Symmetry: D2
Subunit: 312 residues, 4 copies
């Protein structure tokens, strides 16, 4: 050891997009691919391997098994089933929870003692299932939460204000894929406060922004309609969260984190701003939501509790 090994469990377009980001940016020394479809994992590992000689620096990429989780620092789970028509979100929970229990059990059986990063829908709930089943500390079980939505939000706000998205300070919180909410009260465009931009004599108004949030919320749907699936966005989000952990960044991301009184709520994983470092979630940040945002956040926690019922 003295190095970072990432094991990816689930080798579909989401896992592999993340893997490719990881190869492009040479973040981990070791990157292991695991899937129930071993042949797919092998083909992926081969194809990704062949990118490495042209990457900035090396990464050892191979197709492995759960055994390889023994010495892993981070396990990223993207495996699971998508929601069918004729199914509800609760059915999605049931069937992925069941898959997750087997996956997590096999992982812990290997002797794994690192950090989980969960990407599979529904992500907050499956993070919770992973925490329950693993018996690891709540800090060391993390979900991608609303990191992707916040990225989409920043991108679209960027277009609207004509500013690079790296200068936009904007966040989405709540349950990814159901009840996400925009934190208008803490949005900065460059240095400018959102309130200030709205109050000045220009063409910027709240109605335009509300359309943007809806476009954020429905983005997966618009992408799926056009290209069959979504993966490039989530891939980079998982890349981002991975860097924050493995490079001990103390940076702030809206990951799935377990609430313990923050925002007056408890006992769920949900998307909230958290500080990430090598120990995982160092802490949850409690922003001062406007009363509207607080209402939406409470609503999101309540709906989440109801959706989680099959695993409680």
């Amino acid at each position: 050891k003295g190095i970072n090994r990432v094991v990816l469990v689930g080798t579909g377009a989401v896992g592999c997009s993340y893997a490719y980001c990881m190869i492009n940016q040479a973040v981990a020394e070791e990157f292991v691919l695991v899937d129930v479809n071993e042949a797919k994992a092998e083909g992926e590992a081969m194809d990704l391997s062949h990118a490495v000689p042209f990457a900035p620096a090396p990464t050892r990429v191979w197709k492995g098994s759960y055994e390889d989780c023994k010495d892993a620092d981070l396990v990223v789970i993207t495996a699971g089933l998508p929601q069918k028509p004729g199914e509800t979100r609760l059915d999605l929970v049931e069937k992925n929870a069941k898959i997750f229990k087997q996956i997590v059990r096999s992982i812990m059986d290997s002797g794994f003692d690192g950090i989980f990063l969960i990407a599979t829908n529904p992500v907050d709930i499956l993070t919770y299932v992973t925490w329950k089943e693993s018996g690891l500390p709540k800090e060391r079980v993390i979900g991608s939460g609303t990191t992707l939505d916040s990225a989409r939000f920043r991108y679209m706000l960027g277009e609207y204000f004509d500013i690079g998205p790296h200068n936009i300070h904007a966040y989405i919180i709540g349950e990814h894929g159901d009840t996400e909410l925009p934190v208008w009260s803490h949005v900065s465009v460059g240095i400018q406060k959102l309130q200030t931009l709205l109050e000045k004599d220009n063409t910027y108004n709240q109605e335009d922004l509300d359309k943007i949030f809806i476009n954020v919320r429905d983005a997966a749907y618009h992408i799926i309609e056009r290209k069959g699936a979504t993966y490039y966005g989530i891939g980079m989000s998982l890349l981002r969260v991975t860097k924050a952990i493995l490079n001990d960044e103390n940076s702030v991301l809206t990951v799935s984190a377990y609430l313990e009184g923050q925002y007056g709520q408890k006992d769920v994983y949900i998307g909230v701003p958290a500080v990430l470092n090598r120990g995982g979630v160092r802490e949850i940040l409690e922003v001062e939501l406007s009363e509207d945002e607080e209402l939406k956040f409470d609503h999101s926690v309540q709906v989440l509790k109801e959706t989680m019922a099959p695993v409680l």
Copy 2:
């Protein structure tokens, strides 16, 4: 003015893998997606855009059209059709040559005056077709040739010798496909010459290496069989070539270049070692091939010329 624009034509797995590398590494300021399937290109452009806020630096990414090629610096063509069950080598040449002819015409119609990077199989031939239809200088029409195979070769040699693939100097030349050849006589592992390594007292011997070359040559079949297609390797090699051109590197890559006398051979685009920079192919390097290598290169050239007959 004073920035780089890349236009991608063909928004399949190969093109989009390349775009994703370009976003991960922030190589060009502007990156445009063009495809006959406009909806697919839109959805890809969206999904890719959402990765940008978590990337190192911004790229502007959008779905455009042929007219966006007017001020493009580099046009990368990955459009075309794979060989379907039932069709011969010549069927594939004919159908893709017909398609490329129309695509290249449309791009020239826009006023495009940059460099072509061609990635579609059969690459050497389609590079030749692009040159013929466009009327651009031969140094400004470029195919990915054997860059990927060279990369795969370096990777497997890396495994065999227990050395990072970034320290291995191994190249494949000739037509991309089953007539390509490893330039054995110029291989070095670390600083060490291959001959030195094979004559020493160890487990290393030439026959293991012959087997490795065959695995490299046929690698695409094994990947496609497992995961349905190949794209990650080629994505990165297109990235690599783009960096050599856009960053004026004067680096050596085995791209498809037009021979006029080198290797005692002429009038084909074929994979050879070339120096690349902002002007395209600066020159072709003529290595001293061993006897066998020379025979193999000769064979490769003439098989290429015979495959080419429906376009000439």
Copy 3:
């Protein structure tokens, strides 16, 4: 062309630190060193050249002359004399203005038609002198302004709040090296508003923060006392501004920009938030300063006008 050439004028510790950042990050294809002390420029160019083979990608580094400015995209000026004891800031202005007039004249004589980035103290005033003497548009003459102070501010706020400085949104504006001011009203720690953190029941208070600002203001002095000079900080700041321009980022930096009514002030270069891209300063952002900040900013503009007198 189709590539970026940077010419550095002034090859002291500041210019060379910037050059080294530029080599480490492979931002420009071409990087030319010019100084009155040619031997020093030659030695520097040699030493920096020898770093390139181990850098991520190449840069062509050479010692040149003003002639090389003809085809340059960006000229960075760090040349000039430091303030002696027995001199006032006005004397510093006089003697560097005089040097700048010769430097700028020789540059324009080469046929230069790009962008100026001024780093020499006093930076806002010398940016102004450069604009007057060059006859270029105000957008294309830029000073490092308070970018470095803002970086120091973010770093020290980072330490104080236990958050990576990349998550701190904090700015300093006004005249670098005399009358800089902190924009408390637009400081975010992660997502958290500064106001919110101060109002909660914790150990964070305004007095601690005011000490931090003073430590920002006096930082050059503390560094100079200890190591004789300051350069690593300004070097990275100039790196940062250069990326924003050459990579057409539309990012926000507190550079020296020419005021035209923003903040109710005009006709000076001073440190303010501006959007930077390949055309230079695209626009100045006018934040809603608290009344205190507005008072400080007005004060800073007035003092600057008085200090500028010898060049008016």
Copy 4:
């Protein structure tokens, strides 16, 4: 735990240049500065810290002391004294060996159990001294050896042949200084073997290259004469070596390694091609030297052994 800490001992231009590379490239999470001149180390730590907010990702940088070596992964020693006017080769060996002995004792006293990277002249000897005083395994005590000279050599060859130095495979070996030798027989420019290039019909010929080697060997004198010292080249080569170790690269660098039979030679630390990874020197590579090269390497080893007498 699970992060990398580098401690720099000696905060002169060489150490700080290296630190600046480490910050530019965000290689280690923690970087600590230790020097006998505590005030200089503080001021350097401050100046370097202020670059971090504009760097790609965070590094924690601070002035510490020997006790911070307890949990360090890598200790880089650049401390020592340059040869003053009046002193002989042996005076420099004696004085620096005495200094290193005390520094290495102090570090071991802290509980340090990592890898040593030695950069101070005379490096091969001081690497040997570090090994003797520390009692650590020989593979975990490493000197920068001829890495820089190899880099300089690649750069000038790059100029001569009009090829990016990243495509040139050229190495210098032996004792760092005037007995080092270019391994001519294993040089390749692009893919092309040097012999091939010299026998073809062109302006290239061996004598130009002999002159280039001499320029490389004596390069430090020419730089020091011009700009007072040399640091940028060595900074980057220390960066390079650090990446090989910390990122477990299994790459080949001509570091100072302990011979036990390779090249028919033993019991000295000297510049040879070695494979580096997280454990330090994994193995030394034995190339087939030409007759002259072998004689030169023999000569280099024995001159080294004679220089070494005051420490043995």
